Design a protein around this motif. Structure first.
Motif, PDB file in Angstrom:
ATOM      1  N   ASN A 296      -0.389   8.491   1.108  1.00 22.15           N
ATOM      2  CA  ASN A 296      -1.699   9.085   0.850  1.00 22.15           C
ATOM      3  C   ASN A 296      -2.572   9.108   2.098  1.00 22.15           C
ATOM      4  O   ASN A 296      -3.203  10.129   2.397  1.00 22.15           O
ATOM      5  CB  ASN A 296      -2.397   8.330  -0.280  1.00 22.15           C
ATOM      6  CG  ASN A 296      -1.955   8.797  -1.656  1.00 22.15           C
ATOM      7  OD1 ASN A 296      -2.707   9.454  -2.375  1.00 22.15           O
ATOM      8  ND2 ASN A 296      -0.723   8.468  -2.024  1.00 22.15           N
TER       9      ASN A 296
ATOM     10  N   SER B 246      -6.982  12.422   1.254  1.00 22.90           N
ATOM     11  CA  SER B 246      -5.706  12.292   0.570  1.00 22.90           C
ATOM     12  C   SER B 246      -5.489  13.534  -0.276  1.00 22.90           C
ATOM     13  O   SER B 246      -6.457  14.183  -0.689  1.00 22.90           O
ATOM     14  CB  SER B 246      -5.675  11.032  -0.306  1.00 22.90           C
ATOM     15  OG  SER B 246      -4.617  11.080  -1.246  1.00 22.90           O
TER      16      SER B 246
ATOM     17  N   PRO C 222      -5.456   5.718  -4.578  1.00 20.94           N
ATOM     18  CA  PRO C 222      -5.050   5.038  -3.344  1.00 20.94           C
ATOM     19  C   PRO C 222      -4.937   6.012  -2.181  1.00 20.94           C
ATOM     20  O   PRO C 222      -4.471   7.143  -2.334  1.00 20.94           O
ATOM     21  CB  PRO C 222      -3.688   4.441  -3.711  1.00 20.94           C
ATOM     22  CG  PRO C 222      -3.782   4.205  -5.178  1.00 20.94           C
ATOM     23  CD  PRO C 222      -4.594   5.353  -5.717  1.00 20.94           C
ATOM     24  N   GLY C 223      -5.377   5.563  -1.008  1.00 17.29           N
ATOM     25  CA  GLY C 223      -5.331   6.365   0.192  1.00 17.29           C
ATOM     26  C   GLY C 223      -6.560   7.207   0.453  1.00 17.29           C
ATOM     27  O   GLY C 223      -6.666   7.797   1.537  1.00 17.29           O
TER      28      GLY C 223
ATOM     29  N   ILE D 237       0.829  -1.201   0.000  1.00 16.37           N
ATOM     30  CA  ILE D 237       0.000   0.000   0.000  1.00 16.37           C
ATOM     31  C   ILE D 237       0.865   1.253   0.000  1.00 16.37           C
ATOM     32  O   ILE D 237       1.800   1.393   0.798  1.00 16.37           O
ATOM     33  CB  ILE D 237      -0.953  -0.014   1.207  1.00 16.37           C
ATOM     34  CG1 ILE D 237      -1.993  -1.123   1.036  1.00 16.37           C
ATOM     35  CG2 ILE D 237      -1.619   1.347   1.384  1.00 16.37           C
ATOM     36  CD1 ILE D 237      -2.808  -1.405   2.275  1.00 16.37           C
TER      37      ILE D 237
ATOM     38  N   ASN E 211      -6.351   0.353  -2.777  1.00 16.15           N
ATOM     39  CA  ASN E 211      -5.198   1.222  -2.975  1.00 16.15           C
ATOM     40  C   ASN E 211      -4.120   0.528  -3.796  1.00 16.15           C
ATOM     41  O   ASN E 211      -3.146   1.164  -4.216  1.00 16.15           O
ATOM     42  CB  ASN E 211      -4.652   1.673  -1.621  1.00 16.15           C
ATOM     43  CG  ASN E 211      -4.533   0.532  -0.629  1.00 16.15           C
ATOM     44  OD1 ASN E 211      -4.468  -0.637  -1.009  1.00 16.15           O
ATOM     45  ND2 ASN E 211      -4.529   0.868   0.655  1.00 16.15           N
TER      46      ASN E 211
END
Lengths: 176, 34, 97
Positions: A112, C54, B21-22, A108, C6
């Motif tokens: 982020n 994010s 992502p995130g 991962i 992700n």
């Protein structure tokens, strides 16, 4: 005078065994990406000069001794966290992902996702204690050479941003 | 390969969104509004 | 599947059938259970609502899946018969304020 929070008396729980396994897995994947970014390739025989490593096989196929290399820092860090007693509870979505449960490098992207305000206080004081352990070993090996203030031997607050970035990123990665 | 005749005669339209992502998927809703 | 979006993608596809008025959603190649039937002459705007956790949050993609006209053909009368996806300068992201 570095004063690491002693955690040897505390005992590791069962509940964190899966977390230790999966964080060792993540560290193994990050190591695989690091080596592939350096250009490393998988091979049956280990040779550091020739850019070759069997351990880009999955962490499960890694032997238990090679696994413990990643495991021991993770166990020590989580024990050191647990000495202060931080109530680390697996929520419903945690045990949910639990029941939900060279290779292509897949881990991962952790930059982020973001920790909170209070979690940043958590991580900064981790990095304080955590640099403290580093300074303990540095001072021991300092008496081994017999004397002289190390340039980074100054306290964590006295350290500036660049040398503390390594400790922040370790703490924030583990919290993330 | 998309069939040219069906593609020409059809009135069906499509768009997609890629949740990076995130970003928490529960925090993101996708659809149509009037 | 779970947390593992992700890794790559999380592409949420929105499919609209103008002739029938049926609104269907695809996620990673599977048709989702949710479906909406709208009245005739309804004007529908592509919209994504997101609370950002994010620096990079969501991305509109104007691609076309198998046997489906892309969004530009429906949006623009001139490109009604053009299968190539297009993002002309008139199309732009609008936010509520």
């Amino acid at each position: 005078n570095p004063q690491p929070v002693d955690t040897s008396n505390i005992t590791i729980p069962e509940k964190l065994e899966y977390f230790i396994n999966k964080y060792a897995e993540h560290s193994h994947d990050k190591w695989s990406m690091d080596k592939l970014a350096n250009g490393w390739i998988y091979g049956e025989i280990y040779s550091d000069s020739s850019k070759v490593q069997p351990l880009m096989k999955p962490y499960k196929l890694l032997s238990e001794k090679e696994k413990e290399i990643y495991r021991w820092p993770i166990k020590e860090s989580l024990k050191t966290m647990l000495a202060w007693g931080w109530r680390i509870e697996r929520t419903r979505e945690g045990d949910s992902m639990a029941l939900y449960n060279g290779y292509s490098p897949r881990a991962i992207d952790m930059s982020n996702v973001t920790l909170s305000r209070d979690l940043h206080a958590m991580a900064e004081m981790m990095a304080e204690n955590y640099h403290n352990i580093w300074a303990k070993k540095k001072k021991m090996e300092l008496e081994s050479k017999g004397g002289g203030n190390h340039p980074l031997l100054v306290p964590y607050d006295t350290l500036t941003a660049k040398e503390k970035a390594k400790d922040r990123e370790k703490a924030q990665d583990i919290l993330k | 390969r998309d069939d040219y005749d069906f593609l020409m005669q059809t009135s069906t339209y499509y768009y997609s969104v890629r949740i990076f992502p995130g970003q928490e998927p529960a925090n993101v809703w996708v659809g149509w509004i009037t | 599947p779970g947390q593992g979006r992700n890794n790559n993608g999380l592409e949420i596809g929105c499919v609209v059938d103008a002739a029938s008025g049926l609104l269907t959603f695809i996620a990673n190649g599977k048709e989702l259970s949710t479906y909406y039937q709208v009245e005739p002459s309804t004007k529908l705007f592509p919209a994504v609502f997101a609370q950002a956790t994010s620096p990079n949050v969501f991305q509109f993609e104007l691609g076309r899946i198998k046997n489906v006209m892309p969004l530009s053909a429906g949006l623009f009368k001139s490109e009604h018969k053009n299968p190539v996806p297009q993002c002309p300068p008139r199309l732009h992201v609008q936010f509520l304020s």
